[PDB]
């Protein structure tokens, strides 16, 4: 009825795009190419090993990075100055009718928060877990209180610690692994689970 208007004129549509594709990969070899990134982003032809060789990301992403600094400031405070990116991606798209954010979007905006001197900052843990934190937050500085919590309870798993301190299980794991890295906690790994204890080896 009107699907055959699609299936065909769709097959043709691709040719039209393909031209912008084919003759833009040749454009790789030699605002400079800023307009080229805006040219690329609109298509959806990513080109990291040329794009991020010269011209980093997009100015749209930039306009967006400052958006989020305002958006997240208080929610961050409420959550102890740190959120995983996936909690952030929810916080942001849920508070919107339409024109939402792709995971790449939010990620790319986040990627330049630093060069932009805005108060938030994207970190990546060695687990590969991406996170956002306020200018004033350092996990390194939180490690004392983690050790204090473990000692008041004898020892504890990631889950237990998360419940007591009111933080997510993910972020508690990182916090305790870090305190271990720094020699404040040792580990007791059993069937009972992976418990953290004060590092009595580095005392006594």
């Amino acid at each position: 009825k009107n699907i055959s208007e699609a299936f065909e004129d769709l097959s043709k549509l691709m040719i039209k795009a393909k031209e912008m594709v084919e003759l833009s990969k040749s454009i790789a070899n030699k605002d400079e190419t800023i307009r080229f990134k805006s040219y690329l982003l609109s298509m959806g032809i990513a080109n990291p090993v040329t794009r991020e060789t010269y011209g980093s990301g997009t100015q749209y992403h930039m306009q967006l990075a400052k958006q989020l600094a305002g958006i997240l400031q208080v929610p961050l405070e409420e959550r102890g100055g740190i959120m995983s990116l996936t909690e952030v991606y929810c916080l942001v798209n849920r508070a919107r009718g339409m024109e939402l954010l792709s995971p790449e979007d939010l990620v790319n905006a986040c990627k330049m928060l630093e060069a932009l001197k805005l108060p938030l900052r994207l970190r990546v843990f060695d687990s590969g877990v991406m996170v956002i934190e306020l200018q004033s937050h350092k996990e390194e500085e939180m490690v004392a209180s983690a050790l204090e919590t473990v000692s008041e309870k004898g020892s504890l798993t990631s889950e237990e610690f998360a419940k007591l301190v009111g933080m997510s299980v993910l972020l508690a794991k990182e916090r305790l692994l870090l305190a271990e890295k720094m020699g404040h906690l040792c580990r007791d790994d059993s069937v009972e689970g992976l418990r953290f204890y004060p590092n009595l080896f580095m005392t006594q």
Binding site: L10, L13, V21, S42, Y89, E99, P103, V107
Partner: protein, 219 residues
């Protein structure tokens, strides 16, 4: 402006394309795949960005980017029963239960589409092939290919057993027991000492119960 001429060309071709074929992509699953599968041949991604034209005019962005939020939330509401593992079936069943008067518009393929984009948020989500469906992991765990293989073996009965691990995978006893240990430490398996033959390790992620999901709606 050597390239920008052909840029505005494309804008107006697509907009027309949209105007008479809007709700089709939104109305039948089979048609979505077509449009999508051709894009990856070209070397374009309609879902890459909200500043993409494809998303701006077709609305494939706000459909999928939204599907991700919903997928995140279902997994969290459920993560306490099941450990961070859900079948693609139950995920589907739940995303629909929470979509409302539009409780059909999403397919299994749509879900998998969305998780693939979620992977860019960093370690978090993962898709695991089993028998004839997929398991979705929503909390981090490590590479152990040994962990995948057991998941795949578990899938046929909802549980697994050392004797069964050794015979099917031709593995050493310590190696089976070690992966079992991981399943317990992560909350993905619970032990059962009243099972015929020897201890069974059952995964709540499998195991059909079709009920409730409230109290944990608070993320």
């Amino acid at each position: 402006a050597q390239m920008s001429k052909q840029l505005d060309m494309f804008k107006t071709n697509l907009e027309e394309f949209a105007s008479k074929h809007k709700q089709e992509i939104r109305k039948n699953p089979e048609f979505r795949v077509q449009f999508q599968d051709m894009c990856a041949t070209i070397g374009v991604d309609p879902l890459a960005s909200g500043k993409g034209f494809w998303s701006e005019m077709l609305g494939v962005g706000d459909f999928y980017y939204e599907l991700g939020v919903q997928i995140i939330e279902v997994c969290l509401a459920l993560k306490h029963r099941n450990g961070g593992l859900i079948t693609l079936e139950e995920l589907h069943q739940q995303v629909l239960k929470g979509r409302g008067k539009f409780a059909q518009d999403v397919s299994q393929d749509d879900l998998i589409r969305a998780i693939k984009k979620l992977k860019a948020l960093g370690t978090g989500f993962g898709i695991i092939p089993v028998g004839g469906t997929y398991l979705i992991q929503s909390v981090p765990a490590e590479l152990n290919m040994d962990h995948t293989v057991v998941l795949q073996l578990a899938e046929k009965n909802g549980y697994v057993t050392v004797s069964e691990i050794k015979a099917s995978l031709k593995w050493e006893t310590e190696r089976a027991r070690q992966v079992l240990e991981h399943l317990l430490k992560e909350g993905l398996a619970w032990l059962d000492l009243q099972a015929p033959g020897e201890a069974h390790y059952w995964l709540p992620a499998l195991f059909t119960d079709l009920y409730s999901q409230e109290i944990t709606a608070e993320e």
